[PDB]
Design a protein around this ligand. Structure first.
Ligand SMILES: Nc1nc2c(ncn2[C@@H]2O[C@H](COP(=O)(O)OP(=O)(O)NP(=O)(O)O)[C@@H](O)[C@H]2O)c(=O)[nH]1
Ligand SMILES: [Mg+2]
Lengths: 302, 390
């Protein structure tokens, strides 16, 4: 099943990454960031550019061409929204173990179609789209997050937000706890990876001793993650979990339909729901690091 | 995105979905003469606002009721004058309501059913959401008796199967020959739902007339913003009064602007991070006037218009900049802030929090600028500073 590919979320020293949209302006920039950070970027693709070198690495026409010749195991997509969904499908066809689609703006209908087959296979794990990516502090950085704030540590960060993810990262490094693995699942409704996937990885990673979940109002993402922890992060060796949900001060949204209300039945409910699973919700976004730190001291883990 | 009923219904017309024939009118006199042009027994008048619950709503005019019908055209203008320009308030509007600014051949109703097609994560794609007991009280009926709500997931590859359309039609109570006409209308709605890249198509009531006609009496369509590049003609139809002109001029340079009632104007590179800043400002006692999102892209032009825009309305005695993760060295935008601040000459305090590539050489750019620009280190610091400006 598709869950069998969760393991591919945990990038590391060895994963060999390639870049779809390599010559693109964003592809090039964030590709350099990865090379300078130490990520093992072995090349990228760009139709009509196969056989030319870029950033000192080979460019290929398709992904299979780029995979067999480099032995890649992860891909990061910067293809523009109109063709990004196809970029994913190309990686799945090439059975790339991990695909990280950064691109924001993919039509929901495209991703509904991508995700449809994605759930019918277990070879390729997808992160995103419209996410900052995944970063193993020190070992591998797949995405746009600034690497100069991370530090290999004991805390696993899972975030549905974007730039807000960096606050939790910058605060856990400052307190000295560092990050074991930070994953951004993005803000799109139909994605390859959700909270429950990263929590499963975090709850079973020894290097992950504390957890920070970052969310925001809207949807049921946070509640589903909450019910998971309530059924798998309870009992004996329970790993402390901290959370911050942005938007408690957001105004009403102005509806135009009953559909959303009927399928539902954000705000305080997300907060108190996470609390039900024993999660410590930091009210301010500035004290995420200072909170997880103390939850570690509450049970003598420093 | 969201289009008005009359616009969503014309789309339905051009795609085999049957609705009432209608005419649009800007003034209350044209609504009266246009109601005379319709030539129909009973006529229904509806207020067009990007919001539901119009029927059970109130009016700034005290008209009480966003939808009404009568067999006397003169009553159209009589009732149309009383809302053109007023704020229609419903249980979906933000209390104040929406400034109103259609006359259709009213048809007789013998049975109301709720029908909606949408993309839903839990269902991993399209869903047929229906209930035999539709009407305005759908949400109440949905809450008191959940079992009255029928869901049918659709396979995005196979599409709407006749067996699925027939089952939904049957669950909505369409018996006899109606079951086929309704099922076909369900298939024709789903196909349109996919054609237009809609996240939601809600038909409430999905009506049954005494003459055995399955009609869509109301059309609420939500369009996927991410599909605008493929839906040119449809996104061309979004009226030129989307919220407020303060919002539209912002979007001209792709800047997401959300307005509020406050004194601090936020400026963040991230929706989630923008809502967070608004939160922590609230915790410290401030109250943000709004926030202007940057997402990821950044250009010296946007910072120029960004400041020119936030200082537009006079309800901003301070602005807060919080750029944490710009794809460009903020040392470059720091000079885009100074340039966009001394040439614009703004008379409001300015709090800046930057964190990223070479932030040391960037923070001193503001300090040694001679301009009213206070620097901040963390999110908590940025908030207390912005609050400290009264
Ligand atoms: N007899 C009759 N009643 C109508 C007609 N059009 C609307 N109504 C009545 O008006 C009610 C609500 O109007 P409608 O435009 O459908 O939607 P609404 O007021 O915005 N409510 P909601 O947002 O819940 O769909 C319907 O439930 C129905 O009782 C019509 O042509 N004939
Ligand atoms: Mg209706």
């Amino acid at each position: 099943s598709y869950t069998a590919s969760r393991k591919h979320l945990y990038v590391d020293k060895n994963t060999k990454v390639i870049c779809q949209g390599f010559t693109g302006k964003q592809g090039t920039f964030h590709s350099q960031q990865a090379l300078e950070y130490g990520t093992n970027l072995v090349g990228g693709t760009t139709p009509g550019k196969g056989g030319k070198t870029h950033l000192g690495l080979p460019v290929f026409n398709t992904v299979k061409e780029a995979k067999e010749q480099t032995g890649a195991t992860a891909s990061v997509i910067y293809v523009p929204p109109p063709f990004a969904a196809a970029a994913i499908n190309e990686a799945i066809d090439a059975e790339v173990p991990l695909v990280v689609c950064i691109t924001e703006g993919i039509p929901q209908q495209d991703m509904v179609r991508v995700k449809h087959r994605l759930l019918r296979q277990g070879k390729t794990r997808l992160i995103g789209p419209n996410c900052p990516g995944v970063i193993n502090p020190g070992e591998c950085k797949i995405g746009i997050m600034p690497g100069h704030i991370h530090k290999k540590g004991r805390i696993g960060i899972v975030s549905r937000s974007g730039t807000l993810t960096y606050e939790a990262v910058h605060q856990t490094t400052q307190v000295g706890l560092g990050q074991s693995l930070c994953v951004g699942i993005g803000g799109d409704p139909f994605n390859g990876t959700d909270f429950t996937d990263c929590l499963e990885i975090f709850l079973n990673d020894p290097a992950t001793e504390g957890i920070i979940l970052i969310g925001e109002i809207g949807g049921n993402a946070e509640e589903n993650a909450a019910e998971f922890l309530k059924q798998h992060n309870s009992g004996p060796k329970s790993k402390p979990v901290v959370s911050f949900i942005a938007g408690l001060t957001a105004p009403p949204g102005r509806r135009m339909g009953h559909a959303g209300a009927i399928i539902a039945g954000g705000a305080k409910e997300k907060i108190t729901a996470l609390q039900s699973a024993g999660v410590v919700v930091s009210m301010s976004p500035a004290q995420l690091g200072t909170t997880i730190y103390k939850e570690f001291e509450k049970r003598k883990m420093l | 995105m969201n289009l008005q009923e009359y616009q969503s219904k014309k789309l339905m017309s051009d795609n085999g979905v049957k609705v009432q024939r209608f005419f649009v009118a800007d003034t209350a006199n044209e609504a009266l003469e246009a109601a005379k042009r319709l030539n129909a027994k009973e006529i229904v008048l509806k207020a067009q606002i990007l919001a539901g619950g119009r029927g059970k709503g109130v009016f700034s005019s005290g008209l009480k009721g966003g939808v009404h019908l009568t067999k006397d055209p003169e009553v159209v203008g009589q009732l149309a004058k009383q809302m053109i320009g007023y704020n229609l308030a419903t249980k979906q509007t933000p209390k104040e309501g929406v400034k109103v600014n259609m006359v259709a051949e009213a048809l007789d109703i013998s049975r109301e059913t709720y029908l909606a097609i949408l993309m839903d994560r839990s269902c991993n794609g399209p869903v047929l959401v229906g209930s035999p007991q539709g009407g305005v009280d759908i949400e109440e009926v949905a809450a008191s008796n959940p079992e009255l709500i029928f869901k049918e997931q659709i396979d995005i590859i196979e599409g709407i199967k006749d067996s699925q359309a027939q089952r939904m039609a049957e669950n909505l109570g369409f018996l006899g020959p109606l079951q086929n006409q309704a099922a076909d209308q369900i298939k024709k709605l789903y196909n349109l739902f996919l054609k237009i890249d809609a996240t939601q198509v809600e038909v409430n009531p999905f009506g049954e007339t005494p003459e055995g006609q399955v009609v869509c009496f109301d059309a609420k369509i939500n369009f996927d913003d991410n599909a605008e590049f493929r839906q040119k003609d449809i996104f061309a139809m979004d009226d030129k009064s989307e919220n407020e002109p303060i919002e539209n001029e912002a979007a001209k340079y792709d800047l997401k602007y959300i307005g509020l009632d406050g004194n601090i104007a936020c400026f963040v590179n991230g929706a989630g991070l923008a809502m967070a800043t608004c939160d922590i400002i609230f915790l410290n006692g401030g109250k943000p006037a709004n926030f202007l999102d940057l997402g990821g892209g950044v250009k010296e032009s946007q910072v120029y218009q960004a400041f020119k825009l936030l200082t537009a309305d006079p309800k901003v005695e301070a602005i807060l900049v919080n750029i944490f993760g710009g794809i460009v060295n903020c040392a470059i935008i720091a000079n885009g802030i100074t340039k966009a601040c001394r040439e614009l000459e703004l008379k409001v305090p300015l709090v800046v929090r930057l964190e990223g590539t070479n932030v040391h050489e960037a923070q001193n750019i503001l300090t040694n600028s001679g301009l009213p620009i206070t620097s901040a280190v963390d999110l908590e610091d940025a908030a207390k500073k912005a609050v400290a400006s009264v």
